[model samples]
Target: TSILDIRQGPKEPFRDYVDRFYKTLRAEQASQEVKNWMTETLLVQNANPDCKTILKALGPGATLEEMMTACQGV
Candidate 1:
């Protein structure tokens, strides 16, 4: 799983934060499998609104940088 150290300033959209995080992952060269997993996980999170599940599924072993890359191609 990946660690999401996300922060939002006033008036910032959550989607923008998510997009930026994804971009960071892409820049780090994350694996395709991780990206696909993240995509599905994000979709589920959006539909169900479960942050804990999403975070748990992502796990701590996955790096934020790697996930960023994986998500780009996803």
Candidate 2:
């Protein structure tokens, strides 16, 4: 099973979605690439107003909590 049910993902708010995704995941189960994919899919694709700025600040090895923090201003 995946961390999130792929079909219902877009219905969840960004913060809720991220927390749930991390909680649902097994410890260190996903690779950085997977994390990035999830970030882009959940955040960027949603057209969040601060998405670009957040992504730029994210750099490498960014986590869900950091993403939420960066996006808070938007």
Candidate 3:
């Protein structure tokens, strides 16, 4: 299945969504290189509007951990 199917629920808290998203992502059978790429793209693409805004503000070089922490605080 496509990672795109793993969307954050409309009412889901950002931390819970990030945890579940990474949990599922880690289980996918892929190389670490591919998984890392997926982590960056999927996390940002599926984030809620508020979370997305904060993530984008971190600029293009933002790490997944940075994005998660930023969103969880919101």
Candidate 4:
């Protein structure tokens, strides 16, 4: 963990990739702009293709994990 590489793995799953990125972010000192950009990118990656599921689940304490679960559909 000496050298923190923020590069996402080529085939990493969205959840795993985001986890790594978040962990790296926590271990290092980064500017607000960088953090914002990373967060934006994470949200983009975590987007659910299904419209209704994601839309229905949006609220406080909500996250992509919830989006993903609902996107799994009933």
* Candidate that would win on TM-score: 3
Pick by TM-score: 2 or 3, better one: 3
lDDT of 4 by residue, 5-50 (tens): 4543434444554566667778768788977776655544544344
- For model 4, what is the alpha-carbon lDDT of residue 50? 45
**lDDT tens digits, residue span 2-50, model 3:** 6678877666777787888877886789999999888778877887787
- Each prediction's Cα RMSD? 10.5, 5.3, 2.0, 6.4
TM-score leaderboard ranking: 3, 4, 2, 1
Query: How far is 29's C-alpha from truth in model 4 (Å)?
Result: 1.6
Instruction: Provide the lDDT at 26 for model 2.
Output: 41
CA lDDT for candidate 4: 0.53
User: Going through the candidates in order, what is the number of backbone clashes in each?
Assistant: 8, 0, 0, 0
Tell me the deviation in Å of residue 37 in model 1.
1.1
Error of 3 at 5 (Å): 1.0
In TM-score terms, candidate 1 sits at 0.36
Using all chains and alpha carbons, the TM-scores for the candidates as numbered come to: 0.36, 0.40, 0.78, 0.41
Where does model 3 exceed 4 Å of error? none
Instruction: List per-prediction Cα lDDT, in the order shown.
Output: 0.49, 0.56, 0.78, 0.53
lDDT of 1 at 4: 48
- The 10-residue segment with the lowest total lDDT in model 2: 3-12
